[PDB]
Amino acid sequence: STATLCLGHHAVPNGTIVKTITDDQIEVTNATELVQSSSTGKICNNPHRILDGRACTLIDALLGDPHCDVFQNETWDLFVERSNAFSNCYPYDIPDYASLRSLVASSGTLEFITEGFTWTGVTQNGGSSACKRGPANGFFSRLNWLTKSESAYPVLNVTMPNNDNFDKLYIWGVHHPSTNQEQTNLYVQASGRVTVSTRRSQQTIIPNIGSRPWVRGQPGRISIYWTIVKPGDVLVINSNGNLIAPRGYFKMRTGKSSIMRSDAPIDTCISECITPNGSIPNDKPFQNVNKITYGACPKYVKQNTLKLATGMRNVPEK
Amino acid sequence: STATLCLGHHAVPNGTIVKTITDDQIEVTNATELVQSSSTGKICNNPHRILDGRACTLIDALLGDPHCDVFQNETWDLFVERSNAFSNCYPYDIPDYASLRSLVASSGTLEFITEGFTWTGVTQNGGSSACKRGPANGFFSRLNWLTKSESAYPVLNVTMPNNDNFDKLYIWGVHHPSTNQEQTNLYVQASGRVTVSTRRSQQTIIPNIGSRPWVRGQPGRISIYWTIVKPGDVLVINSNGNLIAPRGYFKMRTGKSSIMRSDAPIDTCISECITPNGSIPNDKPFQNVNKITYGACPKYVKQNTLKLATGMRNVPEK
């Protein structure tokens, strides 16, 4: 007459190992993976405007090194430097290289407006062998090498107002001759001087002669500096020698633009998140590809795998 | 014959919504708030000693710009720099201005102690039409503009020992003429040199001549530096031109003094936690007014609202 009713849960053959507070190893019936641990080997050309630096460094593209003149006025949500880019122009040094690269990469543009700088008493557009724009001599497309004119180097002094409503990025630099004969010979004065100032800032440099390892045959070097001039402020360049004058300025903007060191080929797809290792899907809280990422991404975690249990404990039958 | 006892629980008319490990929305009978989101708008005047920089920046008060004389030796828990401060003295420039603003700010005092330096062979207390102190030409109160005397400028060399038990912060500087003529005229030597040292350190700065943009009519510029002398050490200033000598020192102290940039009015009340948007209540764990804080403040977080269920789950009633 009795009847028998038994309640029961389900169960499965292959369960999932999960950790819990009271168990670094237990077996449930189901879970998902939270640690995105794979890549696709490539960078999606979208949605982020990508720019392959190819053989050029953001810097060189900025200065105007011949083989990068293709990059002029480029924009980029993400500039991508490659391990094989090279510089093919006059030997240069940039104290605080890091910071220039960073503030340019972040502005994410290279619009360059040329201004009418007047250099009276000096010769312009000088060139060098180490910087062959074509088979003939040249220089950085954005810089003006200035040399003596009719046996003399004036106390250069030019003003250039910033009457616009945005900031201007002027980058210039000074020349460090290999020997005294080369100094006197190029600028006449046995000792040069460059002063670039505004109402807010002032940086003055003093060339320094000496011989340095040959690079594209040049023992001497050009040190590179930058100056930002705010709206309403004015730029004043004062120099009686060794000045590598400005030709204009770079428009500065504020955005989500940046740069990344990578060799991943750039393909055509959609990936909000980008890593040096290429694109990776943003559906998992965590990821184990590269601490280095760009865009909507999953926090990087030492752990290469974490399983979120999503089903009851799995208690099999025998 | 029989009775009926029924256990139950309360239920309110309008519960509050809260998130749980399995609900970003469920309804309880009550919740408190863990995120302070509003500010009185003003900075309460006293659990902390607040000093209003009015028209002066901590630096200009430190150097002694004429209209910042009211701040001579002021002390503070939190210095408030107003966005509309301005400089009305000689054109200057401080390399690493930020670090100097920071160490003075943390010192929390402008106690200036005048010592008896010995400037033999030069004229003292030079002044400028750019730092008018009254109808006349003044200069920074804590600085001494030395120029040539009776057709000469000695190889100035002075010594000031630290026979105290506390540290002395010396603030001196050097002058950058606008032309060679100004150089030889004020200092005679066609090239200046300033070397301020201790047994612990040295910093020798060389003036750089050239035209900078007119600021209150002045083309030149004064470059400012600083030196910390420890008890048992002595200061030694050696310069044969262009030295903007010290008049003593500022006693350095350690505390919880700091500085903040805000335009909020200061009022009379009692508030431990100050922010650029005004004081706020530290009775909550998280705040959303601003990441900038002074005092016993609530940890800042992005979300603007987080409800802590302080009541059971509300289940309507029919």
Add this chain to the structure above:
Amino acid sequence: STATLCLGHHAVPNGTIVKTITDDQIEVTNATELVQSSSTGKICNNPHRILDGRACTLIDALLGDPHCDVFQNETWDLFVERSNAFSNCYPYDIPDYASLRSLVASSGTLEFITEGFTWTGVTQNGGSSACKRGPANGFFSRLNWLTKSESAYPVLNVTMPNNDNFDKLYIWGVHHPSTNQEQTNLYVQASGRVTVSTRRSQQTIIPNIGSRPWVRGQPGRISIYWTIVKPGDVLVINSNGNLIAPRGYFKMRTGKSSIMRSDAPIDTCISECITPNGSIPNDKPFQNVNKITYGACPKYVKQNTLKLATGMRNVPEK
């Protein structure tokens, strides 16, 4: 007739108070500490190769201060500087001292490889009474003080290629005369210069004459600089005065080496964790010893104690 069965749990005489989510104080039958708060007061001699600087600063050692030659080429897992160490060689000053000390400490070795000098035209091995080496006037072991020779200081210019397979760490310096008479008298030129470059960098330093407070009787000083030459690159030293030349180079390796300032005595035991307080046990998850730590250790935390309950709730009995 009948019987009575009761179920229960234990309790103890003296339990342990514990904090939960609904009590900052609640007794449990037992717990275990998670905050290592005590130290032996001595640093175990290993498994970490420890090196006691004794009275030498990792910099003084590197430079070769007489009483620190004992460390010539030592190696270390953890260099330990003492509060009583001192310097007794010529007065020096290193711009970005912190940085040098750092990069060396992490290299964990003083491997010095003397190289071929080429100082043709100058008097070598300059020495000072402020740096006695026995009865004689010595100087840092790794540095070569160059002066004039037969009334004249050549326009020194040497080259040193990096043909090995590891980065070389050269450290040189430039001397600052106390007076002009000293300048001319030592380097003949009235204005010295030192430039040490590579195909990758270039740093040119200019001497600065002036009087500084005596140090072991000397008013002059040596500013010290370093350069890292990369494999395939080459070093070049161009100077016509005031150069304190390099004798060779240090081999730079990468590992787990580092430095710590402690007066803790180095005893003979085995401890994985080292702190300025001596070694400590790493069996717990957190420590309140020191935030400064070397090796495998627990995370510093502000709390001096956190009891992790390991038993149920202790309930007395009236």
Add this chain to the structure above:
Amino acid sequence: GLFGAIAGFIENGWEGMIDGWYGFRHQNSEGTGQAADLKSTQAAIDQINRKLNRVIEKTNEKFHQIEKEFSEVEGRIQDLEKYVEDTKIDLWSYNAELLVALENQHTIDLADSEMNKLFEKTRRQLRENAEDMGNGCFKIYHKCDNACIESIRNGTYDHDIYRDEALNNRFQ
């Protein structure tokens, strides 16, 4: 709630209950009545207040720190300063989000438990004199006037005095 009392085997709530979080509602020869259980209610409030306090009375001070807004573009150093403060914020915004999540989930289960605890306490008191009707109500198989109900609510109910009258009803 892991115990399934509130918003479970117990259909609704009582907006009628003003003096407590949990209570009794009977119906006997004398009519109906209602009353909150002070020992139960206080039990959960005390627990929730403690929990709340663990989270409110605590804040630490910080005075001099690092700048957080800048006027000019600097570069490397300024990048780091902003990354650090941002990192701090993201982490802290995280704990804040989890805390409440955890706290609230536990808070509703706690409230559910304490309801269930009150039922068991009551079922155990009536012993063989009533039966669980499954909806949070007990059917007391014996006359139980206002007094008798009261004795149950203040836990002085003597199951013996009625076991026979009830045993009859229940098993007849």
Add this chain to the structure above:
Amino acid sequence: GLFGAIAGFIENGWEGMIDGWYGFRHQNSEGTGQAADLKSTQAAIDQINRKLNRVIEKTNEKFHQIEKEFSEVEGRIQDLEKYVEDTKIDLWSYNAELLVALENQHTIDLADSEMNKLFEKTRRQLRENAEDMGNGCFKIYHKCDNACIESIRNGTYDHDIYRDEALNNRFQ
């Protein structure tokens, strides 16, 4: 598990139940059957789904940041850039580990809890007509055919109708 039903007083699960997480198996006069409880299985699912969603639907965008790999030795400033990124990584890894540990424990306990509600839901229906055999089975002390078993499964069963029969078989 906190309610000790799953992997508890219910020796083990059924691999043959492919239509839900919870359900019934019976053996009455007309043979043996097996139905699943949708109400139950669903409730657990919905709960574990929402828990999941909270955890996966969230990511933060981070464009220009600080560098993290270096081609040359620098010292002070670089050591700092590293410590910052290394400290950051370690904090999240801790957040990530603790997250799943906590989430999982609560997942497993939530399933156990559900299982048990269905058992206690069932128990209260059967009243004085059945007994808890201890293996998760209810021994219905009266004749309960497939029409009867079903009435129980989605709570339409009426204890009164079979009480007298049951009591008779129980207390004999």
Add this chain to the structure above:
Amino acid sequence: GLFGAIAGFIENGWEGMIDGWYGFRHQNSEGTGQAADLKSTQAAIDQINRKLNRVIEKTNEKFHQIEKEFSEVEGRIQDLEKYVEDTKIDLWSYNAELLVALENQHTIDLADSEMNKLFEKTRRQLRENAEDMGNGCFKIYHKCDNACIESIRNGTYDHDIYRDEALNNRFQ
């Protein structure tokens, strides 16, 4: 405790028990006894032990880092070196504090659960032979000597053997 057993319906613990966590205490014809339940005790201990190991055997290595003490004022750069370190410690000190809190709060409930699993395990065994007195004690309605009791404790108790004898005492 969410399960209201320990510090709940079970008045208090037993200082007299020194060989285990949970156990029984009887008072049969032959006097009174006491014996700790190994199975249940071990379950508790094992779980909280793992819990423990998950927290103790883990610490990572860090060597060359950043200076954390300074002998002279520097400014911007240093301010950052402190602020970074300070923010790290505050975050960690927070993780620790919340970890014990959660953990403990759980260890306390886990134990209160395990107890309740034992109470329930027994109740079930005794079927209709006993009655929950409400204090964690069952009143067995039939002569139960030491051999009888023993059987319960190691779960081989044959509820039938005494059902009649028991049913009669219960309902008379």
